Coordinates of C-alpha atoms and ligand atoms in Angstrom, one line a residue:
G1 CA -54.0 5.8 58.2
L2 CA -57.0 5.2 55.6
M3 CA -58.8 7.3 57.8
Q4 CA -60.1 10.2 55.5
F5 CA -62.1 12.9 57.5
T6 CA -64.9 13.7 54.7
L7 CA -67.3 17.2 55.1
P8 CA -71.4 17.0 53.3
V9 CA -71.4 18.1 49.9
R10 CA -71.7 21.9 50.4
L11 CA -68.9 21.9 53.1
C12 CA -66.3 20.0 50.5
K13 CA -66.9 22.6 47.9
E14 CA -67.1 25.7 50.0
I15 CA -63.9 25.6 52.2
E16 CA -61.9 25.2 49.1
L17 CA -63.2 29.1 49.0
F18 CA -61.7 31.8 50.9
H19 CA -65.3 33.5 52.0
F20 CA -66.1 29.8 53.7
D21 CA -67.9 30.7 56.8
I22 CA -67.0 27.6 59.6
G23 CA -71.0 27.9 60.6
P24 CA -72.5 27.4 64.5
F25 CA -71.9 23.3 64.9
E26 CA -68.8 24.0 67.0
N27 CA -68.5 19.9 67.2
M28 CA -67.8 19.6 63.5
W29 CA -64.5 22.1 63.6
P30 CA -62.5 19.8 65.2
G31 CA -63.5 17.7 62.0
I32 CA -63.5 20.7 59.4
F33 CA -59.0 21.4 60.7
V34 CA -58.7 18.0 60.4
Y35 CA -59.9 17.8 56.9
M36 CA -58.2 20.8 56.0
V37 CA -54.8 19.1 57.7
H38 CA -55.0 16.1 55.9
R39 CA -55.8 18.5 52.6
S40 CA -52.9 20.7 53.2
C41 CA -50.2 18.6 54.6
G42 CA -51.2 14.7 54.1
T43 CA -52.6 12.1 56.5
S44 CA -49.3 11.2 57.4
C45 CA -47.6 14.8 58.4
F46 CA -49.5 13.7 62.1
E47 CA -50.9 10.7 64.2
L48 CA -54.2 11.6 64.1
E49 CA -54.7 10.1 68.0
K50 CA -52.0 12.9 69.1
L51 CA -53.3 15.2 66.5
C52 CA -56.9 15.3 68.4
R53 CA -55.5 15.8 71.3
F54 CA -53.5 18.5 71.2
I55 CA -56.8 20.5 69.1
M56 CA -59.5 19.5 72.0
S57 CA -56.1 20.7 74.5
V58 CA -55.8 23.9 72.3
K59 CA -60.0 24.6 72.4
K60 CA -59.8 24.1 76.1
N61 CA -57.1 26.8 76.6
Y62 CA -59.7 29.4 74.2
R63 CA -62.0 31.8 76.9
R64 CA -65.4 31.8 75.9
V65 CA -64.5 35.5 75.1
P66 CA -67.3 37.2 72.5
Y67 CA -64.2 37.0 69.4
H68 CA -61.2 36.1 70.6
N69 CA -62.3 32.2 71.0
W70 CA -62.1 29.0 69.7
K71 CA -64.2 30.1 66.3
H72 CA -61.8 32.6 65.7
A73 CA -59.0 30.0 65.4
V74 CA -60.9 27.5 63.5
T75 CA -61.9 30.4 60.7
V76 CA -58.1 32.1 60.5
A77 CA -56.4 28.6 60.9
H78 CA -59.2 28.0 57.4
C79 CA -57.7 31.4 55.4
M80 CA -54.6 30.1 55.8
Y81 CA -55.9 26.6 54.6
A82 CA -57.3 28.7 51.5
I83 CA -54.0 30.7 50.6
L84 CA -51.6 27.2 50.9
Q85 CA -53.9 25.5 48.5
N86 CA -54.0 28.4 45.9
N87 CA -50.3 28.5 46.6
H88 CA -49.4 24.8 46.4
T89 CA -45.9 24.8 45.3
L90 CA -44.5 28.0 46.7
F91 CA -44.2 26.3 50.5
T92 CA -42.1 23.7 51.9
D93 CA -43.1 20.4 54.0
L94 CA -42.6 22.3 57.5
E95 CA -44.0 25.6 56.6
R96 CA -47.8 24.0 55.3
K97 CA -47.7 21.9 59.0
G98 CA -46.3 24.6 61.2
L99 CA -48.1 27.4 59.8
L100 CA -52.0 25.8 60.1
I101 CA -50.8 25.1 63.6
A102 CA -49.9 28.2 64.3
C103 CA -52.8 29.6 63.1
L104 CA -55.1 27.5 65.7
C105 CA -52.9 28.3 68.3
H106 CA -52.2 32.3 67.1
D107 CA -54.6 33.4 70.0
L108 CA -54.6 30.6 72.9
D109 CA -55.7 32.3 76.2
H110 CA -57.1 35.5 75.1
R111 CA -59.0 37.5 77.6
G112 CA -60.7 39.4 75.1
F113 CA -58.5 43.1 76.0
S114 CA -55.2 44.5 73.9
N115 CA -51.7 44.7 74.9
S116 CA -52.9 48.5 75.7
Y117 CA -55.0 47.4 78.4
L118 CA -52.7 45.0 80.1
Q119 CA -49.4 47.6 79.8
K120 CA -52.3 50.7 81.7
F121 CA -53.5 47.9 83.9
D122 CA -50.4 46.3 85.0
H123 CA -50.8 42.7 84.2
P124 CA -48.3 40.4 85.6
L125 CA -47.7 39.3 81.6
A126 CA -47.0 43.3 80.6
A127 CA -43.4 42.6 82.8
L128 CA -42.9 39.2 81.9
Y129 CA -43.4 40.0 77.3
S130 CA -43.0 43.9 77.2
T131 CA -43.5 44.2 73.5
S132 CA -45.8 41.8 71.2
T133 CA -47.9 41.0 74.9
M134 CA -50.5 38.9 74.2
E135 CA -48.3 37.1 71.3
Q136 CA -45.7 36.0 73.3
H137 CA -48.1 34.5 75.8
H138 CA -49.9 32.8 72.9
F139 CA -46.6 31.4 71.9
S140 CA -46.1 30.1 75.3
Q141 CA -49.1 28.3 75.6
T142 CA -48.7 26.2 72.3
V143 CA -45.1 24.8 73.5
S144 CA -46.5 24.2 77.1
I145 CA -49.9 21.9 74.9
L146 CA -46.8 20.5 72.9
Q147 CA -45.5 19.5 76.1
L148 CA -48.3 17.3 77.8
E149 CA -48.2 14.5 77.4
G150 CA -49.2 12.5 74.3
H151 CA -49.8 15.8 72.5
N152 CA -46.2 16.7 70.6
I153 CA -48.1 16.6 66.8
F154 CA -43.8 17.1 65.6
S155 CA -42.5 13.9 67.8
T156 CA -41.6 12.4 64.5
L157 CA -39.4 15.6 63.0
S158 CA -35.6 15.4 64.0
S159 CA -34.0 18.0 66.1
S160 CA -33.3 19.7 63.1
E161 CA -36.6 20.2 61.7
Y162 CA -38.6 20.3 65.1
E163 CA -36.8 23.2 66.2
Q164 CA -37.4 24.6 62.2
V165 CA -41.1 24.1 62.7
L166 CA -41.5 25.8 66.2
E167 CA -38.9 28.6 64.8
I168 CA -41.8 28.9 61.7
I169 CA -44.6 29.3 64.6
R170 CA -43.0 31.7 66.6
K171 CA -42.6 34.3 64.4
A172 CA -45.9 33.2 63.1
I173 CA -47.8 34.0 66.3
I174 CA -45.7 37.5 67.2
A175 CA -46.2 38.6 63.2
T176 CA -50.2 38.5 64.8
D177 CA -49.2 41.7 66.6
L178 CA -51.0 44.2 64.8
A179 CA -48.4 47.0 65.8
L180 CA -45.9 45.1 63.6
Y181 CA -48.0 44.9 60.7
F182 CA -47.1 48.3 59.5
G183 CA -43.3 48.4 59.1
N184 CA -43.8 44.5 57.8
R185 CA -46.1 45.4 55.2
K186 CA -44.2 49.0 54.2
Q187 CA -41.0 47.1 53.7
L188 CA -42.5 43.9 51.9
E189 CA -43.8 47.1 50.1
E190 CA -40.2 48.9 49.6
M191 CA -38.9 45.0 48.4
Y192 CA -41.6 44.5 46.0
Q193 CA -41.4 47.4 44.2
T194 CA -37.4 47.2 43.7
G195 CA -37.5 43.8 42.4
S196 CA -34.7 43.3 46.1
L197 CA -37.9 40.3 47.2
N198 CA -36.5 37.0 47.2
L199 CA -38.5 34.0 49.1
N200 CA -34.8 32.4 49.2
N201 CA -34.1 35.0 51.7
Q202 CA -35.1 33.4 54.7
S203 CA -35.3 36.5 56.1
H204 CA -38.3 37.3 53.1
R205 CA -40.0 34.6 53.7
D206 CA -40.5 35.4 57.4
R207 CA -42.2 39.0 56.7
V208 CA -44.2 37.5 53.8
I209 CA -45.2 35.2 56.2
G210 CA -46.1 37.5 58.7
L211 CA -47.9 39.6 55.9
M212 CA -50.4 36.3 55.7
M213 CA -50.7 36.0 59.3
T214 CA -52.2 39.3 59.2
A215 CA -54.3 38.4 56.6
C216 CA -55.7 35.1 58.1
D217 CA -56.0 36.6 61.4
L218 CA -58.1 39.8 59.5
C219 CA -60.0 37.4 57.2
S220 CA -63.8 38.6 59.5
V221 CA -63.1 41.8 56.8
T222 CA -63.5 39.5 53.4
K223 CA -66.4 37.4 54.2
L224 CA -69.9 37.8 53.0
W225 CA -71.5 41.2 54.1
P226 CA -73.9 39.4 56.4
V227 CA -70.9 37.6 57.9
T228 CA -68.4 40.5 58.4
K229 CA -71.5 42.8 59.8
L230 CA -72.5 40.2 62.2
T231 CA -68.4 39.5 63.3
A232 CA -68.3 43.2 64.0
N233 CA -70.8 43.1 66.4
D234 CA -68.8 40.8 68.4
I235 CA -65.7 42.7 67.8
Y236 CA -66.6 45.6 69.2
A237 CA -68.4 43.6 72.5
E238 CA -64.7 43.1 73.2
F239 CA -63.9 46.7 72.1
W240 CA -66.7 48.4 74.3
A241 CA -65.9 46.2 77.5
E242 CA -62.0 47.2 76.9
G243 CA -63.4 50.5 77.2
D244 CA -65.3 50.0 80.4
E245 CA -61.8 48.9 81.7
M246 CA -60.2 52.0 80.4
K247 CA -63.0 54.2 82.3
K248 CA -62.6 51.9 85.7
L249 CA -58.7 52.4 85.4
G250 CA -60.2 56.5 85.1
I251 CA -59.1 56.9 81.8
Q252 CA -61.5 58.2 78.7
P253 CA -60.7 55.1 76.2
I254 CA -60.2 55.7 72.5
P255 CA -63.5 56.7 70.5
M256 CA -63.0 53.1 69.3
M257 CA -63.5 51.3 72.7
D258 CA -66.2 54.1 74.0
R259 CA -69.7 52.4 73.6
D260 CA -70.9 56.0 74.1
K261 CA -69.4 56.4 70.6
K262 CA -71.5 53.4 68.9
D263 CA -72.4 56.6 66.0
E264 CA -69.0 56.7 65.0
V265 CA -68.4 52.8 64.3
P266 CA -69.2 53.1 60.4
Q267 CA -66.9 55.9 59.9
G268 CA -63.9 53.8 61.7
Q269 CA -64.5 50.9 60.5
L270 CA -63.8 53.1 56.7
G271 CA -60.5 53.9 58.8
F272 CA -59.3 50.0 59.3
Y273 CA -60.0 49.5 56.0
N274 CA -58.2 51.9 54.4
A275 CA -55.4 52.4 57.0
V276 CA -54.9 48.0 57.8
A277 CA -57.3 45.6 55.8
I278 CA -56.5 47.3 52.0
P279 CA -53.3 48.0 52.1
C280 CA -52.9 44.1 53.5
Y281 CA -54.6 42.3 50.9
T282 CA -53.3 44.5 47.9
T283 CA -49.5 43.9 49.0
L284 CA -50.3 40.3 49.1
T285 CA -52.5 40.2 45.9
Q286 CA -48.7 41.4 44.8
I287 CA -46.7 38.6 46.2
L288 CA -49.6 36.3 46.0
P289 CA -51.4 36.8 43.2
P290 CA -53.8 33.8 43.3
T291 CA -55.3 35.4 47.2
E292 CA -57.1 38.3 44.9
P293 CA -60.6 36.7 46.1
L294 CA -59.5 38.3 49.9
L295 CA -58.6 41.9 48.3
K296 CA -61.7 41.9 45.9
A297 CA -63.8 40.7 48.8
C298 CA -62.3 43.4 51.2
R299 CA -63.1 46.3 48.7
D300 CA -66.8 44.8 48.8
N301 CA -67.3 45.0 52.4
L302 CA -65.4 48.5 52.1
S303 CA -68.6 49.6 50.1
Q304 CA -71.3 48.2 51.8
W305 CA -69.8 50.5 55.4
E306 CA -69.6 53.6 53.0
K307 CA -73.6 52.4 52.3
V308 CA -74.3 52.3 56.1
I309 CA -72.6 56.2 56.1
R310 CA -74.7 57.1 53.2
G311 CA -77.9 55.7 54.8
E312 CA -78.2 53.0 52.0
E313 CA -78.2 50.5 55.3
Ligands
LIG1 N1 -54.6 41.6 65.9 C1 -55.7 42.1 66.1 C2 -57.4 42.0 65.9 C3 -58.0 42.7 67.3 C4 -59.2 42.8 67.1 C5 -59.8 42.9 66.0 C6 -59.4 42.6 64.8 N2 -60.0 42.7 63.3 N3 -60.3 41.2 62.5 C7 -61.5 42.4 61.9 C8 -61.6 43.6 61.8 C9 -60.7 43.8 62.8 C10 -60.5 45.4 63.5 N4 -59.1 45.6 63.9 N5 -59.5 46.7 64.3 C11 -58.5 47.1 65.6 C12 -57.4 46.0 66.3 C13 -56.5 46.6 66.9 C14 -56.0 46.8 66.4 C15 -56.3 48.6 65.9 C16 -57.5 47.9 65.3 O1 -58.0 49.3 64.2 C17 -57.0 50.4 64.5 F1 -55.9 50.8 63.5 F2 -57.4 51.3 65.0 O2 -56.1 49.8 65.9 C18 -60.5 47.0 64.8 C19 -61.6 47.6 63.8 C20 -61.9 45.7 63.3 O3 -62.7 45.6 62.9 C21 -58.0 42.7 64.6
LIG2 CL1 -54.7 19.4 46.9
LIG3 MG1 -53.9 38.3 68.9
LIG4 ZN1 -56.4 36.6 65.8

């Protein structure tokens, strides 16, 4: 109960900032997550023995892929911790609990491949989940882990609170399907402008949570330029492996996934920032003003990519 997790002075302070990088020491990442849980939710919200066993089973069920890995899971949980800590009074007890877990588990058992590739390959998961394929798998994997002996971190919840937390996590994980992000942001933009946005409307809370999940999931674009630039290598590592696999199926991949079209990455990145990232952090800053540092850092990285095109780097 009185076993408070503590970090070195530099991490203790920088972990509070949106642009924190969790570092290259894998064995510190569990402690970084518990630290964030204990500060974002409390020391009582979970049994430490169960949470630890849950974290290590989650870790075991992330694959050794270039980007969609254990580091990504913990990085996305940290962005969410930063949002929650800067918006203290806007979120319920169950929401603080559910959202950090949701972020940690949101890419469980990812193979490094898109829903599009699973469909064209005719992977069994495409037959099981026709839409948001990997995201329905990520949630399935989360439930299975919770049901392992001594892994149910939610044990102390009532049938009503347990169903509520599992429902927050499901919606949160499904929202990380980028195909669903575009419509969700449009609706939130419209609602925000017409003044219909009501955080007592559960249907509206869901949409704002979904947008927070997009924001956290894409947060590599909100890091300091060297982190953003070096993460891009890992992101494109997976994209080019998928393009290779598309060519194995006799299908020319889109330029984004074609390793022959490496020259086109910087422009491809401008399109992503302008069409996905900046709109995401723009709408999020409108609903949740304290998240403005994510938008600012994103625009900074947009500028750096434009500098890359103009031969300035
Ligand atoms: N979910 C997810 C996800 C997956 C990989 C990667 C990222 N991610 N995170 C930070 C930056 C990026 C990124 N994503 N895309 C991308 C992904 C998916 C679909 C797409 C994408 O562009 C698209 F608009 F053309 O359609 C392209 C370039 C990027 O730098 C999220
Ligand atoms: Cl606090
Ligand atoms: Mg995902
Ligand atoms: Zn992800």
